[model samples]
Target chain A: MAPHFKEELRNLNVRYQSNATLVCKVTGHPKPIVKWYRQGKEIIADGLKYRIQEFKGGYHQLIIASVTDDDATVYQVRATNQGGSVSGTASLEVEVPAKIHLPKTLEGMGAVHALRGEVVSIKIPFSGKPDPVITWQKGQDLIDNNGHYQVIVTRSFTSLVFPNGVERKDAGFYVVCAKNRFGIDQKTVELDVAD
Target chain B: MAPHFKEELRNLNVRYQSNATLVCKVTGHPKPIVKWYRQGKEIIADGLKYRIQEFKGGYHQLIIASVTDDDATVYQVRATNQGGSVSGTASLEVEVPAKIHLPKTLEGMGAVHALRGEVVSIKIPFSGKPDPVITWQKGQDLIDNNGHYQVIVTRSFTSLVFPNGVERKDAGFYVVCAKNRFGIDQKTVELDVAD
Candidate 1:
């Protein structure tokens, strides 16, 4: 009555609010009993929140209705029988997407003003779990901190700086994108450079 | 023959590479034996590294030479006799002063150039143990993020920004100071504005 695993549990990276299903495959003569655990604590199938299913050939599934920050941890599936017990463990990573905010004056395809021959700056504030990588683009062309252009990132904001004064050529639509493991968010603003 | 304290050990804040002396005063019949401890472990008094001394009034002192990062912890002095034992505890905080760096071109009263009608930025990088407060000054007057000037601080640098193009009036000597609980350091640079 020995219980062993045919296939091991795999690590899962799931987005917030999404459904996650943990699968474990085991084969035994008496069809070993399977139980789910998280961080060494047993997990119960509550019908609504969790669903435990067993199929032919000892294929098991634990369906968690919705994943959250608390769901991000190590999960184990233990198989028990008269001879011995086997456990398969895997980690679950929860990803939270980036979020961006702009002032009322620059929200929703708004325009930012820059006087000709004067320095200009475009600042966008954003936040995310594990931080986010921000990118700046002028229309389709990606921009870097060179050729009179500069970028500064703080804990709370991303700024595009023009060390050289903004000229008429600088008037165009620019895009800022914030991306992380979970998802991405982009915002566009038009710069109006006038004399 | 219980030992009691006439004066308890007080917390010590010692600078890096500086000496720290922890003093504890107790009185009892037959003069209770005293020992020093750090985080429950007994501390031995090496002749060169540590000095343990006793005075006429049962005043005990543990002198630690050249305190370093490892010296910061809870310290205890226990007095034990044939009757009973009493202990005094205090925490040691080792303070580290801030350090600053500048490019060779702008080091030691060096000059930085800014073009009129163009944006200007002065970035100074620094580091410290417990983080430092960075302040900017123009000549002798303290400057804040106001009057067309802005300040942006990142984890490794402090930036002074002129969002509006620099004018001739903006040319002057500037100072930046980094300070922590332990000490302070200041550096100066001259900004030369030209049309």
Candidate 2:
């Protein structure tokens, strides 16, 4: 009979967190040659950053180490021989876990008003590939919904604050979201708007 | 320089029940003969059962129909010539998914005053690989804790009954783990006791 081509995980859909590793398998015969491409670019195997290994049973694999936003895309496997060739493709998307920042304590009812020109700070620590961006929102609304707020842009961090002072309108739940080239995360905090 | 071997998923960790694929890329000045193996066994390539395809690039390919217990093992790749052979090795292991079966509920209670023998039936699908087994357990303890459960075996199925029907003492989750030469699958079913 004539020789044919196939893939181990030909119909795979991988959903991973940012910086996560994605492993793929490819196989074929007369023993076919294998090559891996990510987002249309051939993956380079070296520097110990990404490990690539082959098997005698016609199995080939691709590992995306510390996957990033740039890593999100379709992957292709090409198998070739003197007689003929075949190819297979699959797709993967990366998501970053939700990150949030909140005060250890809300303090009092007029907490929001008390901090009219004051600073309310919170700390957020998380693990993900390609870092993340911190942004503030109020009940599904970006804190700057009306351009009334300014973003204190810091490297790898961000904050929302009203330059003038506190207001009763900002007394609802305060949400914090961390987004990167890879994904977005969000959470809510109950803010007691104080006079 | 002489030809070399390479793969894309050298040291990747994948969880059980989750799907995975492995890919490899090889290069040689004269395009050496490449072959793949899992646990040193050659993967059969047929258009239907297995695949081996050639592409525009100098590469070969192999694919698994579906990863099984037998697939979780060491895989090796070899490239050969009249002079000798060079190769590489990697390992793949299957694991259980974190979100498994959950506790079941019996909504409508009360009624029914007759006693009927409880029937415990277990069915495991058949595969080209080895067969799995069935067992009974309580909370975290084994039923009878020792050998109290009967062994009702069949070529393709098994059944075990506890004789007394709906005993107040026979209520909890019963776990069934079916494993063959390929791997293991554990499923849990909640049982309710009534008069």
Candidate 3:
């Protein structure tokens, strides 16, 4: 019989100095042998930074204490039994507070009017140590990359594009916000649409 | 202001051709925009292989209709707003059924005798397509890497090492089982202790 996982390992992203746990649950006749791996290498339980606990019904847990940047990696679990073997995998990504650069705006930026059928775009150039989170909104509505709007996020800038053109209803205050662990910064651009 | 994750993203391991969903939750004033990435590229919601959904209370879900080997990758989520930004990561590992290539066997090919207080090892050589699960037992009691016994598993073999030494009480039938999705195979080695 081959091993089957009921609850497989999951990806984890934790702040520095926080604790994380990786869980793997397996079921098989005659039981399965369970082990943990990191970066494709076996993880020997060290009791302190790494702790392992095995429970009934084939539940295995790996506890990591005070995770740091170096702890980010792909974690895996292998379960084997006489019937055959199977494995599972997950990954961890760590986050650091945001550090934004100066001039979080577009050069010579101001209110602009576009024809009802003319394509329009609002572009913002920015930089952050860890790449700030970028979002665009019109009035109180959040903007997503949909039929009328397109959002493009890159390491150096974020842009909002209206491919189908702008309408009278699209005239309003468009807000773009950039943030990180350090703080949040906002820029508001007004759009005017005419027939 | 900064975005905070309500429940972090988790890694997933699924059998080949199965369905999987990855979810990320966040909470922040002015809400955060969530984006999903595979490997290092953005995963545009294609509506077929990839589906994306956002909910109230700041929940983002990415659904993979049918998962395959190519779908296995490190998935990441970024939630950003003016308050600041946060991120989470997880990975998916796909499993293939096992197929054994070599017969499971002990090094000596049969029973063996050892003197009291002498270090001993029982080595088993095995090969399987997906790497078989290896386990050892004394009649019915499962063996673990503990004070008297240490278990070592590698790509080609599994060895049970007695570091503190073996005793008369250790004399018994030691059964080793190797398994995968294809099938299970077992071999028993009788241990005889001499005073």
Candidate 4:
């Protein structure tokens, strides 16, 4: 009868990174002689580039000093002795997150009021990756179309100002819309002309 | 011939946002009675929160102050005059961006070395909302299992040490896998016995 034997690599530890080196502490018997293989190729052992060290108690160490894109793949460790051999495999995955997400619609600005000869102000909140662009519109006409209103935009929000005070004739619905390469959002507000 | 009536509400400008104010300016043969309705509900026209300013240049503005949660709906503008009445509709949509996107995997950690009688160091990079977790594993062993190697973990990365320096037996595969609710990625390296 053959002597019962089991080979195992225990105590697996990893160091994360887009490009990095990993070490696993394995324990087993005939006193395991460990070998590592990636993409079906034996890791080239360059004294300064790659090196493997054998230790007491069947502990084995493998090192890759410089890593590259080609270095990216599944790595496996095999341990063997006079009894038999055992092994384990793990894949290395790399990734980066997206920069932003954009919404689909803009709310309409409703009616607002400002007494005759009174200045009025308007503001709105906005968000995006690299800032946003905003424009003010009033009744089929762009604000300051003829220099009637002033507009201001910032990283966080946007604003519009109606000067020369509002009059009965200057009252109605106004619109403010902000946009970016991602998408656009807008709102509507009514201006009432006070006596 | 009917008098020259310019319906200010006809060519009105539209914008998007929540809790906003829209003003409609109208100039026509007879002063237009401007009223606001949202989701088909007639909005009141009094109080500091809302007021109708007199119309100048035959312009009338209706003020819809501080839009509320209920304000996120369709708005209808009805302007009444000697020529009867006319109405227009627009919608407002609201949105705010979430915190910036971060990497799915850790970055910056390199191959670690534990001198025969020295400690090893490890570091990783991952930042943004909801930080990541760091951990160390040895083949199948948890870090510091027998004090042969020391371990350290931070919100971003981790470090492991082997005070007795590495041995031929320590030569094997090691790995670090980074994970979040969304996904997981990893990096692995081999450790070799160094004098």
Report the error of model 4 at residue B140, Å. 3.2
**Cα error of candidate 1 at position A45, Å:** 61
DockQ of each: 0.01, 0.02, 0.02, 0.02
Candidate 3 docking classification: incorrect
Every model's TM-score: 0.34, 0.35, 0.32, 0.36
Report the lDDT tens digits of candidate 1 across residue range A132-189. 9999999999999888799989977888888888989999998988888767988887
Instruction: Score candidate 4 by lDDT.
Output: 0.50
* DockQ of predicted candidate 4: 0.02
TM-score of chain A of 3: 0.53
What does candidate 1's lDDT look like per residue over B1-76, in tens digits?
5898889999998887688999888988878988898899988764335666666677888888778668889999
Model 4 Cα shift for residue B107 (angstroms) = 13
Cα TM-score of candidate 2: 0.35
- Docking class for candidate 4: incorrect
Local error of candidate 4 at residue A4 (angstroms)? 56
Each prediction's RMSD over C-alphas, in Å, is 34.6, 23.8, 19.6, 20.4
Candidate 3 per-residue lDDT, tens place, B1-195, comes to 478888898899877657788887789887787778898687776444676666666777788866766787898888899888777899987664432222211232235579999888876566444567888898899999888899988876677778889989999888778888756877677788999
Best-fitting candidate, scored by lDDT:
1
Instruction: Please state the interface RMSD for every predicted structure, separated by commas.
Output: 34.6, 12.8, 17.0, 20.0
Question: Between the candidate structures 3 and 4, which one is better when assessed by TM-score?
Answer: 4
